[PDB]
Amino acid sequence: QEINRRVQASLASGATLEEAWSAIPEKLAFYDYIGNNPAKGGLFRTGPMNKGDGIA
Amino acid sequence: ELVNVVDEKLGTAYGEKIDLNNTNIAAFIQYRGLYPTLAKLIVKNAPYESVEDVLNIPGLTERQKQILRENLEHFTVTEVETALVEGGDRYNNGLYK
Amino acid sequence: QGMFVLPFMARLGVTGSWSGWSITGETGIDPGFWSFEGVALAHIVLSGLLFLAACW
Amino acid sequence: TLTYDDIVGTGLANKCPTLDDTARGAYPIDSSQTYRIARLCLQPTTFLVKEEPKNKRQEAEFVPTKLVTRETTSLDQIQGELKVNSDGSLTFVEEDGIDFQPVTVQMAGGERIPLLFTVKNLVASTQPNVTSITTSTDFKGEFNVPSYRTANFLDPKGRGLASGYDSAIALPQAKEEELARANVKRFSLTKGQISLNVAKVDGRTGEIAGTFESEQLSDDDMGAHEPHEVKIQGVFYASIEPA
Amino acid sequence: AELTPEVLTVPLNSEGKTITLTEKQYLEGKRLFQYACASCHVGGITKTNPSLDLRTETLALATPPRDNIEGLVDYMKNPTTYDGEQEIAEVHPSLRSADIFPKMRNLTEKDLVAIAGHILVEPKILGDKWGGGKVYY
Numbered sequence: 257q258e259i260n261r262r263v264q265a266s267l268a269s270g271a272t273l274e275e276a277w278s279a280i281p282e283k284l285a286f287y288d289y290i291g292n293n294p295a296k297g298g299l300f301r302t303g304p305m306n307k308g309d310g311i312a
Numbered sequence: 313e314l315v316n317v318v319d320e321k322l323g324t325a326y327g328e329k330i331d332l333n334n335t336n337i338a339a340f341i342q343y344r345g346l347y348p349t350l351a352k353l354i355v356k357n358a359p360y361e362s363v364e365d366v367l368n369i370p371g372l373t374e375r376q377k378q379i380l381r382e383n384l385e386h387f388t389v390t391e392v393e394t395a396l397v398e399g400g401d402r403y404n405n406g407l408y409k
Numbered sequence: 410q411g412m413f414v415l416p417f418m419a420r421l422g423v424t425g426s427w428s429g430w431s432i433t434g435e436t437g438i439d440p441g442f443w444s445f446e447g448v449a450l451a452h453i454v455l456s457g458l459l460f461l462a463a464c465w
Numbered sequence: 466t467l468t469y470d471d472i473v474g475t476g477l478a479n480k481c482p483t484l485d486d487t488a489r490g491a492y493p494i495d496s497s498q499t500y501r502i503a504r505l506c507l508q509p510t511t512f513l514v515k516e517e518p519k520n521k522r523q524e525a526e527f528v529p530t531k532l533v534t535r536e537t538t539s540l541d542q543i544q545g546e547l548k549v550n551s552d553g554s555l556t557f558v559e560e561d562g563i564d565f566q567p568v569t570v571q572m573a574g575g576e577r578i579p580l581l582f583t584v585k586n587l588v589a590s591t592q593p594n595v596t597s598i599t600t601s602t603d604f605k606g607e608f609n610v611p612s613y614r615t616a617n618f619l620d621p622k623g624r625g626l627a628s629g630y631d632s633a634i635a636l637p638q639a640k641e642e643e644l645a646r647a648n649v650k651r652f653s654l655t656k657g658q659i660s661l662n663v664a665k666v667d668g669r670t671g672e673i674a675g676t677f678e679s680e681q682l683s684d685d686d687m688g689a690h691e692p693h694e695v696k697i698q699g700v701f702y703a704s705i706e707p708a
Numbered sequence: 709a710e711l712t713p714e715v716l717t718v719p720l721n722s723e724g725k726t727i728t729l730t731e732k733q734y735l736e737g738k739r740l741f742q743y744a745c746a747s748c749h750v751g752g753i754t755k756t757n758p759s760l761d762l763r764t765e766t767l768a769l770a771t772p773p774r775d776n777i778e779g780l781v782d783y784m785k786n787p788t789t790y791d792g793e794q795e796i797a798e799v800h801p802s803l804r805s806a807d808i809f810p811k812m813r814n815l816t817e818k819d820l821v822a823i824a825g826h827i828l829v830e831p832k833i834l835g836d837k838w839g840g841g842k843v844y845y
């Protein structure tokens with residue numbers, strides 16, 4: 257929702273689609289990924305999140 | 313480079329029309345007058361180089377020819393795909409309701 | 410292949426498996442009971458019988 | 466004359482008919498007459514698999530195997546046109562019948578080799594000028610070997626060609642490239658070869674029997690691995706008829 | 709929502725005429741469909757040939773058209789394949805084959821009309837469930 261808000265504000269101010277999305281911090285996009293949702297694990301899937309989907 | 317041949321075929325006319333060379337026989341229920349009599353004759357006499365060649369099946373009645381002519385716009389032909397015609401799959405492709 | 414007991418079985422005439430192979434590279438041989446597997450099983454059963462005798 | 470109740474559970478249903486030792490006659494071919502094989506039967510007695518070359522790249526041999534799928538191996542009730550060609554050779558054009566059997570044989574050491582033992586779409590021809598079918602007649606030809614599994618077959622992870630997942634869903638974030646061969650199912654279609662050697666002919670009834678040897682590829686698991694080369698040997702029976 | 713006269717209003721023929729069934733005819737139709745047809749046609753499908761269902765759109769494209777009372781009543785007397793090409797009374801329940809399908813022996817013309825009306829009304833109630841099979845259960 258916040259990502260979309262920011263993109264719409266960029267577009268409203270005259271940015272191109274490429275520019276609007278390029279202005280989204282990588283840190284914000286990363287929170288919008290289910291691999292970082294804590295309800296996606298397994299009891300015996302041991303270790304860091306990096307051991308699963310990999311090091312981002 | 314490995315390809316799923318059925319998915320690939322869905323991007324041809326096979327994905328848009330009844331392919332006289334490949335489509336399973338139940339597809340002919342879609343249009344008036346084709347099933348089961350003509351459907352059986354069509355599958356039995358496949359493959360066809362062109363759609364109009366379906367009109368050349370021996371023994372047809374004039375009525376049958378006319379039904380075929382009215383339905384050519386719903387037919388296509390593409391290369392025979394082994395995966396779709398083996399296993400007697402044109403007659404029963406493992407799909408019911 | 411780091412085989413230690415296999416050569417001792419082979420040295421005295423145990424050369425085939427119940428699975429059909431022989432250490433000389435033959436196929437479709439029937440080794441009878443005294444395959445490598447039969448030898449192993451015989452030793453396990455002997456172990457058990459000696460264990461029971463020890464208890465007595 | 467044996468009934469189903471005489472045969473059931475004996476193993477005889479998987480055997481081809483035999484002809485006795487007196488059947489060494491000749492069956493005349495009238496080149497003006499049309500003919501059919503009303504029944505072709507093939508009973509395999511041995512399955513041989515070509516060992517995969519160690520890397521010496523000498524001649525890899527065909528080795529014996531153990532049948533594990535029981536008395537379920539024979540091809541039978543096969544019928545087709547027997548054409549008389551202009552040079553006097555005969556050509557059998559297989560039309561229909563129980564013309565395939567899945568078969569699993571096991572190599573020494575346990576490797577199981579499934580194959581679709583088949584003569585699907587067999588076109589087999591004799592030598593020229595066969596004015597009679599005799600114990601000197603042979604048929605040689607080729608057939609089609611379609612994929613051992615057909616397009617709906619789903620692997621243990623639910624993946625298939627005409628149905629199923631198209632990915633390894635249990636490894637949601639694995640790199641796809643290494644798994645492409647397992648994920649993308651392919652449907653094999655290759656050729657096999659067969660020789661039929663007539664050993665017995667009943668001139669009066671049109672019945673012939675003999676030995677066969679066929680060569681074909683085994684199952685490739687919808688493109689997941691390389692097939693093996695198989696050689697099948699056995700006995701055959703055919704009834705020739707004017708039609 | 710109610711079972712209204714409009715829900716109960718279905719095509720009588722191919723020529724634009726309708727008939728409004730009574731609530732009692734609807735009940736009779738369900739009962740008789742269950743009695744004579746549901747063993748194969750439960751929920752609008754066909755168990756012995758799932759390619760052909762009792763959906764209204766499907767019945768409309770049948771030959772002769774079967775998406776009306778007359779078409780269905782005629783089907784129950786003299787059933788045909790989907791293209792009208794062969795008469796199938798010998799393998800499909802009908803009045804003509806009441807000798808070999810004994811449940812058809814006590815069906816009256818009135819009964820056939822009730823069954824026909826059931827086949828047309830049910831999808832108006834059930835939508836995709838009618839002729840949908842297990843996917844829509």
Ligand code: CLA
Pocket residue numbers: 299300301302303304
């Ligand atoms: C509050 C406790 C706690 C929590 C929440 C964590 C959390 C974490 N640790 Mg730490 N850790 C702890 C205490 C804890 N630790 C202790 C006490 C030690 C010393 C052993 C460690 C040493 C440690 C190491 C060396 C590592 C971690 C790592 C991790 C991460 C992976 C966790 C994992 O894979 O677990 C897996 C959990 C399980 C498989 C569940 C175990 C359930 C047991 C076996 C049940 C036993 C049942 C019992 C026998 C039944 C009895 C029945 C009877 C009554 C009848 C995670 C952030 C990993 C990491 O990524 O490091 C950077 C890592 O490498 N931890």
Ligand code: CLA
Pocket residue numbers: 414415417418421423448449452
């Ligand atoms: C019951 C009879 C029996 C038989 C037929 C076998 C057979 C076999 N065993 Mg088993 N075994 C047995 C009992 C038996 N075993 C018992 C009771 C034990 C527990 C001690 C074992 C423990 C055992 C081990 C640990 C191993 C075997 C192994 C083997 C294989 C190789 C044998 C070998 O090289 O011997 C070699 C034996 C000798 C060289 C004997 C030496 C005799 C000394 C020098 C005698 C000296 C004293 C004498 C009194 C001197 C005076 C002599 C006089 C005539 C002048 C062969 C399949 C091998 C194998 O392949 O395992 C799978 C192996 O590693 N066995």
Ligand code: HEM
Pocket residue numbers: 744745746747748749754756757760761762763766767770774780783784788789790796800801823
């Ligand atoms: C009196 C009760 C029945 C009625 C009113 C009825 C109605 C119909 C109708 C209208 C169709 C045509 C479907 C279409 O055009 O889309 C049909 C087809 C069919 N029904 Fe029934 N049916 C009845 C009983 C049964 C029973 C008991 C069976 C099973 C034994 C059955 C099996 C079939 C089959 C196999 C078809 C397809 C026939 C073909 O076209 O080859 N029906 N039925």
Ligand SMILES: CC1=C(/C=C/C(C)=C/C=C/C(C)=C/C=C/C=C(C)/C=C/C=C(C)/C=C/C2=C(C)CCCC2(C)C)C(C)(C)CCC1
Pocket residue numbers: 455458459461462464465
């Ligand atoms: C001849 C021969 C051989 C050999 C053999 C052998 C070597 C044997 C043995 C044996 C043995 C080695 C035996 C044994 C045994 C035993 C026993 C018989 C036991 C017992 C017991 C008991 C009875 C006990 C009891 C008890 C218990 C359990 C617990 C506690 C208490 C009591 C004490 C009561 C061979 C194969 C080469 C080949 C051919 C021939």
Ligand SMILES: [Ca+2]
Pocket residue numbers: 600601602662663664
């Ligand atoms: Ca010969």
Ligand SMILES: [Cl-]
Pocket residue numbers: none
């Ligand atoms: Cl449908």
